[PDB]
């Protein structure tokens, strides 16, 4: 969920989206390691068996037939095989058959985020709105991470659906938490919809991935997934 | 050889005659402006004041 | 020098490497599947106390 | 009309019926059995390219720096290239 | 005791522009308030929907514009 | 002489107009920034750089005319190459105005929620697309017909009526730019208005600037034809002018249709 | 012929890169700083013991990286 | 002038050519690794 | 006075090529100094040498990107090798339209001055390589740095348009006699295709940044959210330029590599028509996909699917090209000189970069990997390795020709090995960090990512050693007291050469041709 | 068929004059002496000085 020192590959998954992403990347990498090793082998054997001391005669062939069509066709079926899963992932990730259970606007201000779980208020003025500031260097306890810990984190009920409406107020931004596999852009004019559904409790960390002005990378995002009873208690207490 | 020159001469003369008539039509119109629209947010924006700031060019 | 033999051995090595990587991926997938399976129907929880 | 210099020379040639650089297209039949496959050159030695070919076969292109005193045969398609100066034979840069 | 529900998944907007979703819900609520006014049930429904959808800054700015008479669109 | 050069292509002689024009461009750009942001030397630097570019361009075309008309260095092949280069330049300009049209369309097919989801934005009094813009289209259409008349003057050996056709075309182009100026002054909305006004004015302004440069090209060709520099067989300057003017007319036709007809609907 | 020279020069290049790195980022011949989170040398300790049980705002402490670290609670 | 020369450069001729080319390449490198550093130095010399 | 005339004034396509080469070397050194500064800042977590002022760091990344993507590869592929070896190779006298050649080259240095002054004014341009609108807006910058940078892009774009028109008209008109289109070598062909892309795409970038300029200063609303005009419009326009822009930095590399492999395998390029058609198709399909750079912004599903398919289809022809090159080494009589070393390294590392690109081309994978150092590794392998290694290969292969001297061989191989090791160490951990999930363009990173960035920082210094070795090579070449021979090099001694440019002289005389070549053209 | 408003022998005289000098292209004629050694030269000198002063002022943030 959090970044690890000397780590290879993706972080851990807490979303069916991220499971799909891991599987798709692994299929792609399988096909492409096959491609790369085969190309390296053929190049090496071509360079080494004809190294100016075994074959000093150019052997003069320039027109080839029935092999050019073969390396035109076989990469095509390779691409078909590595594009069968990607399309399935796209068209099984787009659909939201179920209704979202909550709605968490994530307004990307200039160098700090804000959130509003507005769907709990009888009035028009919104209750339950706060700001997500990065904790400075000297305001940390002995354990937390650096420039990635946040005051008053995002709270979310676990094992129940979500719908986060990314948008901005000053400049381009991006809501990006990798452990959930969520990345989208907050453009000052539009209201992007992300439907996500966590599967387990715990905290997940992420950062901004777009050039905001100067405190870029100091504008982090923290999402907690907690039990539904505790989420209810927290919301009722925060109102 | 010269028939083409004569033909395009004729149609260009027709063009300028019709255009002069239409200019006579368009002119002599008073052009009274209607009332200014309500100040919607997207009208008359000033992100950075012009070098000749207060009013836009051609006003 | 035999062109077909070289291409055959290249394809075979590519498939061997892909099979090794796929075995890795299958083991990782099994670990994830059993972890979540238990997380629903087993002793494993996630909150410490 | 009005013209002087290079365009004047070009148009005088195209009015007299002669082609100015007709020596720059050899266009000869392939090979040398008893008749050399000849080119023409305004200088002592000149670049010539062979694509070869009776009309069906051909090799892509080979550039050889043909010279006067020595006929040169194409490396791959093996035809002679005998040169015949139609100008003052001199080193191309004097 | 809490509600734990929000705006539904609308058939009209399967894309990622809840900007259009926001504007549509706002217009429907104010069409209520204009025409019916006493359809309090359905129009509280519409009100809850656009409150859940539209960000607070947008809602406040649009309400002030509507009061000022400079609200683009219906 | 060609018989010693052994090839009919053109070999030019050194001229400092490349470097001088580049220095003029640097002057224009730094002056542009220093006038865009308030500074002491802004306006004078921008004007000096702009007239520098004008001067270098003038002496450059003068040098090309001098060579090709008096020295006679243009042979058939370089004559063809000039046509090639100018067609490529027109293609580049087509792509530029395509980018501008894309900006307009991407801003006007699906209008955002913040201009009412409608087009044109409420409170922008769109020009009637039939009073002035129709007259401008008719004027440019007659100008194109007059350019074709000039071309058939040059080709048919009648080298006297060519100046008459060219002067008629220049008069029509001036009438067009005058009416465009009248439209700008009588505009019921300015540039700093919504995306509608913004894209309208940017596209129309660049089209008018292209009209100015095409008109001045035509003026140069008219002076040359009056002086006798053009002949039935050998004339590329006029052909370039004709192609450029046809380009400007076609761009105006697309502009009129899309913006004035559709945008007002 | 030259493999001696090539290999010797490669090793010398690694040596020079190491020396420049050591002077520019270990002793900072060009001014700079080092975080308080790395010089304490006990921060990673607590960071790992906290991956065992990460504190939370609403709810008891909860684990992070459950799969890739194989750390998680039992029947309760 | 050397339009009619057998070699466009004819580099051998100049005066020992060694100091000249050495200074040329070293000044090329100096201009390549002086301005990029100088920009940062000036920015810190500012606010 | 005669020397200043011959340099500042002369048309002489060869001399303009020499000037382009000198400018390319200077710009490359400047870009590498910026890259080393970036690496020095990123060596350890915390503030390393910038001591704050992350704005200056963003300025540094922007200036590095511009310097090396506009002033190093383009002035060396097109202006450097193009200007020289298009008319010499095609068999023609001095290029068509020489004055355009000169004006383009002398437009470039004022563009350089604008870029540096943009990096130097009141605060700086901290907007990244791809200037995005809202950050480059007048509310968020208000400096003028972005104005200067935009004008720099205008000058560079105008110069490249002039050069592209030059090359297109030269190839279409200024060929020799008898030489059909299908006998011009692949370097000429790649320069033609890349010139078409440069002519068609670049004006769109000029329009987009003109629109950005009039949005900043003259107070329009093209990219201001209030009043329509979303920033997505600018994303679309800039990237409709951007991808044709990146299939231009590598096509001359492809041409040079084809020539080098052909001259080292003792045999010409296998499947010539295949090469030509594949390269034309790469050029064409470089346009039909432009948003595969913005998958994570909010396009609908069908556009994402279509751009996925388009990127795969553009992947196929590069495969045809690489397999053709592998085929045209099956002949024999190879000889491992430094140009062959660099061509082989090009093929290998460009293969790695291309496979990573494929991984990135999908939609969901780009959702997970957008704007993380995975993308940086992808385009640093592709662009740096491919373009720069092709550049070095061409430089050795043809410094055999320009100056007339020849480099020392052991130093050439030493430089190849140093640079290969350094620049392949310093960019693979970028793949690993991108998988881990660190965002791109950040001056500080969490403590977790500090493991590799100490190792990658160890890679930049090796590349600096390599570049210094390269300049030692250039100086020892320009002062090598031993001219071109047969023992040194076997290329120019050929009495029969596949390419026309080797059988002329040590340097070309002044007109490159006392008399044009011919072609026998049989079947009388 | 009519020659355009000039005898066309003035052009022939001018052709003789231009082909009968021994200089580069841009220096032929007495007009071009004045033009192409004084106007662009002084103009570029003034342009260079103003460009330098402008870059200096913009960089230093003086003389707003
Ligand atoms: C031309 C393309 C090019 C090249 C060659 C390089 C070279 C290098 N780049 Fe660059 N880089 C970019 C293009 C390029 N880069 C771009 C476009 C970005 C994006 C910026 C952003 O995202 O906004 C970027 C960003 C970028 C970053 C991320 C910045 C950020 O995240 O904050 C980093 C991080 O270290 C980096 C590092 C390096 C390094 C270590 C090299 C080293 O390889 C140094 C190069 C080494 C060489 C071997 C080349 C030098 C060669 C010569 C000088 C000889 C020339 C010869 C003649 C012409 C005869 N680059
Ligand atoms: C330098 C030129 C260049 C080249 C050649 C490529 C190659 C490719 N690129 Fe690259 N790309 C860039 C320039 C380039 N790219 C740049 C500059 C960026 C960063 C932009 C930014 O800062 O935002 C980027 C980033 C980038 C992204 C992500 C942008 C973002 O989300 O951050 C994507 C994804 O769509 C992409 C796509 C591709 C694809 C599909 C190819 C393919 O064409 C690769 C083709 C090559 C092959 C695949 C190898 C040879 C093929 C075989 C040996 C045959 C076998 C293969 C198959 C089975 C088909 N590129
Ligand atoms: C046509 C091709 C040649 C054009 C040459 C035009 C030069 C114009 C003058 C440039 C100038 O004055 O720059 C001043 C500016 C002055 O920069 P500055 O404003 O930082 O000056 C520093 C001043 N002190 C010492 C008081 C702090 O020079 C530069 O920016 C240097 C650029 C060097 C580029 C080398 C390549
Ligand atoms: C190709 C272009 C470069 C691509 C680089 C991608 C690197 C990458 O993906 O590394 C991560 C990968 C998996 O990392 P891991 O820690 O195992 O788990 C992470 C979550 N699955 O970890 C690795 O890739 C590490 C190596 C795993 C084993 C791969 C073996 C592939 C080659 C087999 C060769 C067989 C013999 C051939 C002769
Ligand atoms: C195309 C650009 C051509 C520029 C030509 C030189 C302009 C120098 C400045 C002249 C100036 O200040 O003109 C004043 C004029 C507004 O005049 P105004 O006072 O409104 O009219 C009185 C009516 N009651 O305002 C103007 O004329 C405005 C001119 C703005 C030019 C901006 C140029 C920016 C850089 C462009 C690079 C190309
Ligand atoms: C290539 C680089 C080009 C840079 C251009 C910078 C922007 C120049 C125009 C700035 C906007 C402006 O001043 O617009 C004024 C006017 C629009 O009219 P407006 O002010 O709305 O008047 C109200 C009712 N008429 O008029 C316009 O909007 C005219 C728009 C076209 C301007 C053409 C400028 C050509 C510059 C050529 C440089 C060549 C080198
Ligand atoms: C935006 C910039 C647009 C620039 C357009 C430049 C087009 C250049 C066309 C060209 O080079 O034409 C060649 C022609 C030579 O004349 P030629 O036709 O060969 O005369 C034969 C006499 N027996 O050349 C000529 O006749 C000279 C034509 C000069 C045209 C000047 C246009 C100035 C526009 C200024 C805009 C500001
Ligand atoms: C090989 C070429 C090496 C050139 C080294 C030039 C160093 C110039 C210099 O002194 O720069 C000043 C400054 C160094 O930092 P400073 O403020 O002196 O901090 C010391 C306080 N402990 O410099 C800086 O703060 C920024 C520049 C640091 C050095 C960059 C070296 C880059 C070499 C690229 C090759
Ligand atoms: C796009 C804009 C740039 C101008 C494009 C002009 C295209 C002209 C097409 C063409 O072929 O022109 C030929 C002519 C030079 O012909 P030449 O090469 O001398 O041929 C000798 C044969 N007798 O070409 C010329 O004379 C071109 C002269 C162009 C001078 C331009 C000066 C300003 C440069 C742009 C600055 C932009 C700054 C923006 C702020
Ligand atoms: C091409 C050959 C160009 C030769 C001349 C270059 C320098 C131009 C120059 O003298 O610029 C003036 C500028 C000082 O500005 P100045 O106007 O004297 O100061 C006013 C203060 N009351 O001078 C300076 O600021 C000098 C800055 C040092 C670097 C000079 C060269 C920079 C450009 C290189 C390209
Ligand atoms: N020198 C300035 C004066 C006004 C800005 C400072 N008050 C102008 O230009
Ligand atoms: Cu792309
Ligand atoms: Mg992004
Ligand atoms: Zn032959």
Numbering used by the authors:
A (entry chain b): 12 to 250
B (entry chain f): 37 to 95
C (entry chain h): 14 to 62
D (entry chain e): 52 to 145
E (entry chain g): 107 to 180
F (entry chain c): 1 to 265
G (entry chain d): 1 to 76
H (entry chain j): 47 to 93
Provide passages from the article that reported this PDB entry.
Complex III (CIII2), also called the cytochrome bc1 complex or ubiquinol-cytochrome c oxidoreductase, is an obligate dimer that transfers electrons from ubiquinol in the IMM (reduced by CI, CII, or alternative NADH dehydrogenases) to soluble cytochrome c in the intermembrane space (IMS). In the IMM, respiratory complexes can be found as separate entities or as higher-order assemblies known as supercomplexes. Here we present the cryoEM structures of CIII2 and SC III2+IV from the vascular plant Vigna radiata (mung bean) at nominal resolutions of 3.2 Å and 3.8 Å, respectively.
At this resolution, all prosthetic groups (heme a, heme a3, dinuclear copper A and copper B at the binuclear center), as well as a Mg2+ ion and a Zn2+ ion were visible and modelled into the structure. The residues that coordinate the prosthetic groups, including the covalent bond between Cε-Tyr247 and the Nε-His243 that coordinates copper B in VrCOX1, are clearly visible and hence conserved in V. radiata. Additionally, density consistent with cardiolipin, phosphatidylethanolamines and phosphatidylcholines was seen and modelled into the CIV map. Our structure shows that VrCIV is composed of 10 subunits (three conserved, mitochondrially encoded subunits and seven accessory subunits). A significant difference is seen in VrCOX4, which is missing a ~100 amino-acid N-terminal helical domain compared to its homologs (ScCox5, BtCOX4). Sequence and structural analyses show that all protonatable residues of the D and K channels of yeast and mammals are conserved in VrCOX1. In contrast, several of the residues of the mammalian H channel are not conserved in mung bean. Additional amino-acid differences between V. radiata and B. taurus are seen at the entrance and exit of the H channel. The above suggests that, similar to yeast, the H channel is not a proton transfer pathway in plant CIV and that proton transfer in plant CIV occurs via the D and K channels.
